[model samples]
Target chain A: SGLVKMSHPSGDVEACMVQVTCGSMTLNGLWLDNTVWCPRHVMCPADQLSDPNYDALLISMTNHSFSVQKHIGAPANLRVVGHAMQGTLLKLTVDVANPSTPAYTFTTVKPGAAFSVLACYNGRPTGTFTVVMRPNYTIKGSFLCGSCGSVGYTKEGSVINFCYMHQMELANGTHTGSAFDGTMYGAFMDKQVHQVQLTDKYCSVNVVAWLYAAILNGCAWFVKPNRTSVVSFNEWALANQFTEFVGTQSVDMLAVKTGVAIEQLLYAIQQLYTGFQGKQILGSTMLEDEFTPEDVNMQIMGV
Target chain B: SGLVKMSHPSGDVEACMVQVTCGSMTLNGLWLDNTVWCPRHVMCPADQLSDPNYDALLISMTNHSFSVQKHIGAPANLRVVGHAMQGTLLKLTVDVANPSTPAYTFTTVKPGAAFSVLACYNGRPTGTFTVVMRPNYTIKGSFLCGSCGSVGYTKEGSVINFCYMHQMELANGTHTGSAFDGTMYGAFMDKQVHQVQLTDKYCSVNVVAWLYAAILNGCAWFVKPNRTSVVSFNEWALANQFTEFVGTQSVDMLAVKTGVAIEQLLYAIQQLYTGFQGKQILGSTMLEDEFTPEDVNMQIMGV
Candidate 1:
């Protein structure tokens, strides 16, 4: 039988909190309906596990829905208490062996990782898991998992695809694997020397414009928020520490403001753009759905 | 008895599509979402009716939920088949008698206006109802309902408040009794004399920025417009022939760019501003919306 044993004394698994250390997800309140798709498990090298048959128990999460619930007895505005979730390593009674096996590749682990033992949404005020390069005796000689599909936390998490260390496309011509090699980010990184290049055209204005429109129109279905919420979230987004300033106050500004990354930003824009389909705005004395072109829109300014 | 008799000669109700004369409205597509607010009917003092039971039949649209229905047999070519719906005026049975008496003021229509006999939805393509100066034979010296209350169309329709003559506050006393008195619309057109004044702060930038955001992110319901739509709409907005320009490409530049007015532009911005209240923007790796202060926003321009 493929039955797994539980460590709960009550023998009633339901009585035990499903709250256990698991794979974490980046926090966000809107797109993904306050959830982000994440890997179900952080597979690491066997040497990192305490013991293969260890009694320790923990549940991994698939697609962490960061706490979007309004915090109780708190300011109604900034109620989102938990954003990115974090957790520690737990050994399971399983068969997969660790690295050191020639047939298999080593798990992609980066140095300076952090772990968590608290519930992100409800366990307590979970301080952000800060990954740092420091010496720790208990975990001596052990490898750490990076953010991509393994156990590690970073304000700017490291993305490690063990099977393939991510790299920008090499003209060497085989599929480079990993979406990071996708042209949008690559071309964007290129100089605007390519004038007609869409990458050059897509700039900060696009992000800001899209972001404002999303809030103004209220398309994200998870919550029905208002101007107060917009102001609150706006304040939340502009936290100086969050956005990594790329200079000229561009985003990195948007990144920190949004609590996410560049590629993710483009995806969010596309998502938001799609969300606005079939919605309407209540006008002064009517309801409207079409946009006026610049040519004709200006003529009607008699108002 | 609450039974209102049906009057189709075929005596079959559904067979006769619900179409008849009713009230008219200003046309717009994004605000009020392509449908402007309109009165149920144009009620004139008792004298204007053909007959309370004069064999005429028409259905008044509520919310009139303006025809966002995309037009067929067109190039999708502004295939919006309809924007504002219109029809002829008809008399209906009701207990409330009209006025020649003190309890009522004459319906507030102005002369030099136009009416429509077209269907904005389907009976044929609806043209903008152009109310104008007309010396007619069918009806004599009877008064008309202004845009606010009864039948009249002006591209910019006449707004008549029968209960009161609409005027700016009299140093003499009370409210002008209309939003027109509210400082926003009043001050915007006042030559930016009052800076820090919200009306002044709410300028063409506000309008253009908001409009661009709406399109860039796609908020107004009715349809799912994209960057292409955004471009299409932008072109629609900048008609140079427009811009009641005090000489700048400024919106009157914004007004025509939006295809809507001064009061309407302010209203659109507010609506758009409010629209962004609780939404998020997709960033490099996240979704965000708090607008970056110019001081900080310019710093993140690494891309």
Candidate 2:
């Protein structure tokens, strides 16, 4: 059983057609078909997925076509081809030449956008299907987009919350506490008093509370680009640039280390539970009235 | 004379093989006089496209083979099928039967993308090329791309200057505004606004200008759906509702009228001078300071 449809997420094209292509290769056990306008296809080989642990895949968008392979096992040949395909719309097709191998098709409508393709192999559980997308189409009238120079983050706690205003995306809750390093903006000495003393524990708490009190946010776009080159550059750049100060990554790693220490302190606070006393948190010892952006920076920066 | 490439954007597939079926066809300008992909015939069409503009017109992606039409004005059904083509890729095949009309071939390792073909005609103005997209490729995602919305306003001298945060790709004066009016947040409001005002301006100026910015600033996933829906639906629903409100004829008639208005607004905003002043011309008003989130809500509600 196989199925295929228009590749893009939303448009007049999707609404206009719904033809299905049937074959050993398909997505959702339907036919892979297309029209004159939007041409795309998907393939899901077997009645059930073969790999129960197959969870997610990454799709790269460049030139004109859309492609997906495992994050860990993608072909290195993926390269960008430009001209008409630089940002043209994408269509999906599922090539299930090998049905016995549990032919499958997974995709995302938005280029660079991702979706989870749920599958069952031999009537079993495949890990949650993950889909990454590479998009070619660009809305080209007169709009622009920019980055505000902050890594995307998430709030740990029970519900995973992602930082909406930042550029990078955190993977899971484990990265949450590690994400709150204060150098996202700049150095402590050159920073304002408020910037210097904002501890990782305190910042993380603030961000979490902020998300919880109202809306928690996160999305695929927030996911940080693991630019191998950029990461390598930062590792060496920060160490050399600020022997006495901190950079975003260096401080982030520090925050993770210090977070463990803060957790110890919190554990001690929790142990002081007797009589009318209650456990304290990262910044609870300081009076709320005394907390100011400037005051906290000074304290955290050791200025 | 003919070209082959990706279905959506050009060059999406790698190692895509193309073969032509023709008695004799010129390669670039030289007559190959032989089959390229398959060595069975005298001058089989070559799959590779020599030029970008040269391409075969396709009717459906389901058929990997392209039809060689008799002429530009020939009906689509008159096309003769040639070979099994890949999605997002194309091949050129000149029919040896008639040297005047040629065929092309295309294929992509990945399927489902859009593309276009170009050629010179009549020798007056270089002929315009039309885009040809994949038949049934799924759209992965959509984005409000480009350089439309920005911070700008009128100045004392009536000159306009706009500053776009996403200005990297745009030339200094490349941006022009799009005007839209009608429903928002699922409400019908009869008002016109620059497209950017509804998204970026609102986020930066209106929402962020007040404390509520942070209150609900953490998430956009929930709100984005509504925003996307509103923009998508506004074309139809707004037209229909406006027709009903105006006690006009059918929705089609209202849509025509609204479209005309929108076109007019586009002309004015784009052609006329507007936005910030002094820097670009002679004004001092900045849109960022004038509108508040409340104003946005009020305007959207027709208050």
Candidate 3:
């Protein structure tokens, strides 16, 4: 039951180290039973997740760590403290600690960044089992990694149309690469593994089509601090300053009524920046003739 | 000797609770010697920092806590946890702990969010001191707070040009305001706060200038990830697919090879958009005749 089955949409298959009840597993050559899993690093797709019976799969990253197993309760935190690479080969050190054990650590410097099976009790290492490092990105499938890359495809009979790429870096020094032969559904770093697509292109097409069916959708955006305060202040002052043009309610309340307030004076200056491009286009035939040194300087200092 | 005297570039000043020895310090009415400081939260401006002698000033936030003082040298971890606010007023609780004191906590919701001298012994309450919550942002000086607003000013004798703003939300509805009649400085949130100045007007002029700069300066602009990986792949493939014309290397590497890889792809798409706008002006007398829904859709999907 501890052996949770996880399938990458692209078809990469592997088991998580946490499910092991007895022995131990290695990840990228570093022993996994001793490394602690961080709650923040686990990102399971919402709909695919379930409790006890179908716990979400653990996603792995280079800088993160996992906990080691002891007597089936809580495990000590094991971290991949640091890593060194020779040419394309990697050697990693897993930080280990156990009060009852002699506090020594483990190291792994496998050639292909592969994982192995190794027993770790207290701070000691035991026998090993041969395992492989099969990263999901390498499997035969399409996936959209926010930190990695994406893969997509279409097909008609035997003839296949596809485009695939990944953000995952290769030791080969090639930062970006794609493959589109005749037979394969897509290209990848290792083999067949896939995830969902969430990009501007996907959203504008598929998502927009779906939203057009309803309304629309969004993400990949950070929650930036509000800057509408300047605009908020302007509307407040304009209404309050002119009683003849204003209604009975005090416009000043509008300043604080919105999420955060902005003054109109600053809002107008912001508008001035927005309007600059329009003036350049409409004001002159020659783009070079549109700006004076003073005009250029004014724009530079504004931001 | 462990004390650090720090002064803000804009002149705000405050001490962190991390340097406390045996005595406790009150912050915004809550006791701090019991809370631990997160290593992540402590940021020191490089040029302004020194070792044991001039450690950096401790900046405080609404949702961070400090560790307690104890005889055993270091204390357990403490965090600022969370906060709640009503109007512009706020109430905050400090997570406190001490083995010798009876575990009890304190709360503060002063009109201006001030601190008091209060002892939190073990879990029990003890003697108190009068303290104040002096958030650096509220002081009359320059500061770089990602959460606060910034204003910059330039001085030239009697004529002073200044812009003023704050990230602080007002109970009033307005968000913007001005200071010094017409004199002061500049505006920004964080000191080294660098966000793209992409106003519609500036986009038209400066974007052209920047793209031109790429010809002179290379693609440092493309290194930014803000352009998104969606566009990154498209550009990668387009360049790689045309390698016969690319000469020695694949252009696809440009996508992730540099620090700001996404910028190149986004920059290209941006040019296409600008071209569309230019054609709209020169090619048609009527704006409605410019684009078909399909054309618009293709352009929409392009980004």
Best by lDDT: 3
Candidates in descending TM-score order:
3, 2, 1
For all the candidates, what are their Cα RMSDs to the real structure? 26.9, 24.9, 24.0
Report the lDDT tens digits of candidate 1 across residue range B205-232.
3233334333323333312222223333
- TM-scores of the models, in the order given: 0.17, 0.18, 0.21
Stretches off by above 4 angstroms in model 3 are A1-32, A35-186, A189-303, B1-303
For candidate 1, the lDDT comes to 0.22
Q: What is the per-residue lDDT of model 2 for residues B148-184, given as tens digits with 9 covering 90 to 100?
A: 1111111111221111011111111112211111001
- Kindly list the per-residue Cα lDDT of model 3 for residues B1-303, writing each as its tens digit: 000011101100011122211113221121223433211112333442243111223323335433322221234333445443322212233465433322222222211121212122232211111111221112122111121212222222222232232232221111211232211112212222333321111112222222322322232322233452444534543543211111112222222233333344344434444343433222121111112222222211221
Better of 1 and 3 by lDDT: 3
lDDT of 1 at A261: 42
Looking at model 1 chain B, report the run of 10 residues with the lowest lDDT sum: B1-10
Per-residue lDDT of A1-303 in model 3, one digit per residue for the tens?
Answer: 000011111100011112211112222211223332211212223342232111122223244433333331234344456543321112234556333221222232211111222222232221111111221222211111221212222222222222321223332112222322211112322222333321111111111111111110121111134343533544543443210111112222222332222233233323432333443322221111112121112121211
**What docking class should model 2 receive?**
incorrect
The Cα RMSD of model 1 versus the native structure comes to 26.9
DockQ of 1: 0.01
User: Per-residue alpha-carbon lDDT of model 1 for A1-303, expressed as tens digits?
Assistant: 000000101001001111222324221111112222222122222353333221222222222322222221121221222333222221121122211111211232221222211112221121111111111101111111121211221111122121211111222111111121122212222111222211111222233323422332332332222232333333433541121112223423433543444444334433433454434321111111111111011111111
**What ordering of candidates by DockQ runs from best to worst?**
3, 1, 2
DockQ of 3: 0.02
